Design a binder for this molecule. Structure first.
Ligand code: HEM
Ligand code: HEM
Ligand code: HEM
Ligand code: HEM
Lengths: 145, 141, 145, 141
């Protein structure tokens, strides 16, 4: 569970995030760093190089959708399973996304926040975000069956 | 790396499996699907019920690949290269799932090899399946 | 969450388990299969060969204690975190045991059950046991800090 | 496998680390201890408080080993031979912990090398740390 200080730390940093920018960046980096994750995005067009993935408008669009949902979930840190249940069911039942992808995206997101905020993304802040991304990934995998 | 004793142990155990390898391959996939439900995300086009011909057909392929690996245990990367490509560039199964299928294969062998599955044979088979797994994910990035 | 069918499966098979013998077999196999785990049993004597590990009286005795605790946990499948809290704290604070070993022992125990029971350790029985060993390992790691 | 572009990427990024390698190693360790507290079971003998001489010293040991590895990127198994021996025979680090420290080193580099941490370099670095990790656990069994 996050402590009160950790919750505040997450909230404070996130207030400085450009969710569409960070989303586009985290999803693109997911596709570059862990390229097997491109299997869900064969209809997205050019994914041939790191620059093409990062600049792909459909990758960017999907990133803003995914991170906007993540973003909205930060308001329900004590009800992550409830918040993401229907999205968990969808990801399992219709999209067939292996829940490890949620963990991978979480780790890329942390790397992006570190890149973006530099020294402000301190060890304690990171520790707090690790609980958040673990918690979101666990929530998204919770309804898999 | 697989030692000479590991290779001996793998060949003896797989040799005892013999003609049941395909059946054991399908059993291990059934074991995997039931035990680790997230692995089913890679097979939405399959009937995964007990006795499915799709699982049996795929179990035979997996087992045949393992037989091939046992047969070329000193040259596994090349024997499995087409499968490494397929998994890396087409199926794109997360690497974490290979450890789940390897445990289920091990369990399947244990349930069918009362004499053969000694601690040492178990250890060698674990190593072998991890090595096969490593080869299969070697081209992912 | 074990289903009712899953709980019955676990219970029926556990009535046939000789906890002392299976405990000794499973701990020995953990030390043979993942030999770096021998590092947590520095004073246990001869661990030089597979036969020496399996036959070691300290290993057999310890395995009996470890599986006895696991066995007692099976009466509390809905409250594993609470049932193993004291042992979790012990394993973290005093024994310094890497918690991934709880997962590894769980998997070796599943392999022993498959070996010992053969065909009666069906895919569905196995799945019930996998949920249990995952729950016990999570419960034993829960108090780490 | 590390491609040549990967090696180029790692050498460039890790060379930028330069004289800070020791400080970054320590920060990566601190990031790991706070983010993944179960990793602290491997250092019960240490003063793990922030700024501890012991963590700084161990951070420099870890970084210098990574410097060695980058420098001898085509022959990591040989270059890290004594370390792979030590980890396999004297320590008891489950292999999962290597992913955790590798993620914390990436975070550290990301936080300190804004200009160098591109998507491609991030991928290269990740692959490199995984490769180092593989070398360090290669003699475990
Ligand atoms: C932070 C974790 C994630 C969140 C919150 C999230 C959220 C969402 C949302 C809100 C949608 C749209 C749902 C709808 O159309 O009703 C979606 C769709 C989708 N997501 Fe996830 N997602 C996450 C991670 C991932 C990952 C890691 C992948 C794959 C690597 C993925 C693959 C997809 C796909 C393929 C779709 C369908 C998109 C389309 O049809 O255009 N998601 N996700
Ligand atoms: C010992 C490890 C494995 C081996 C030896 C193996 C081998 C194979 C073989 C031989 C094929 C058929 C290739 C062909 O049709 O040309 C295949 C296909 C496939 N494998 Fe792997 N595999 C392994 C692990 C996995 C895992 C862990 C998963 C996912 C959980 C997986 C998912 C698939 C899928 C989805 C297919 C396509 C099946 C179809 O649509 O018919 N494999 N694999
Ligand atoms: C099923 C999971 C486990 C349970 C329920 C468990 C339970 C126990 C119990 C009950 C004791 C104290 C015995 C007594 O009363 O004397 C103990 C001690 C200990 N356990 Fe665990 N254990 C588990 C897994 C492990 C694993 C996987 C390891 C290491 C790889 C481990 C390492 C130890 C050590 C080193 C001790 C102290 C032994 C000594 O006195 O030298 N345990 N455990
Ligand atoms: C990038 C991966 C790693 C590298 C390059 C690395 C490198 C090293 C080096 C250079 C030493 C010092 C040996 C000496 O003094 O000669 C060491 C020791 C040690 N490492 Fe590793 N290590 C890595 C991963 C890990 C991980 C993940 C853990 C556990 C979480 C770990 C636990 C230890 C411990 C406990 C020691 C002994 C420390 C002491 O008592 O001074 N290592 N490592």
């Amino acid at each position: 569970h996050l402590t009160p200080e950790e919750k505040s730390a997450v909230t404070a940093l996130w207030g400085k995030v450009n969710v569409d920018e960070v989303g586009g960046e985290a999803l693109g980096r997911l596709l570059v760093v862990y390229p097997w994750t491109q299997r869900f995005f064969e209809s997205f067009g050019d994914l041939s190089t790191p620059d093409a993935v990062m600049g792909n408008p459909k990758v960017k669009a999907h990133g803003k959708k995914v991170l906007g949902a993540f973003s909205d979930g930060l308001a329900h840190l004590d009800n992550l399973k409830g918040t993401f249940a229907t999205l968990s069911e969808l990801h399992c039942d219709k999209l067939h996304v292996d829940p490890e992808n949620f963990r991978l995206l979480g780790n890329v997101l942390v790397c992006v926040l570190a890149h973006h905020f530099g020294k402000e993304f301190t060890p304690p802040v990171q520790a707090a975000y690790q609980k958040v991304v673990a918690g979101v990934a666990n929530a998204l995998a919770h309804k898999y069956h | 790396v697989l030692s000479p004793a590991d290779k001996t142990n793998v060949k003896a155990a797989w040799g005892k499996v013999g003609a049941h390898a395909g059946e054991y391959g399908a059993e291990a996939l059934e074991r995997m699907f039931l035990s680790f439900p997230t692995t089913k995300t890679h097979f939405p086009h399959f009937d995964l019920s007990h006795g499915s011909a799709q699982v049996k057909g795929h179990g035979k392929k997996v087992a045949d690949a393992l037989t091939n690996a046992v047969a070329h245990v000193d040259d596994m990367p090349n024997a499995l290269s087409a499968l490494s490509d397929l998994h890396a560039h087409k199926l794109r199964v997360d690497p974490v799932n290979f450890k789940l299928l390897s445990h289920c294969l091990l369990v399947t062998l244990a349930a069918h090899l009362p004499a053969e599955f000694t601690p040492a044979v178990h250890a060698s088979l674990d190593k072998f399946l991890a090595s096969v797994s490593t080869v299969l994910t070697s081209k992912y990035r």
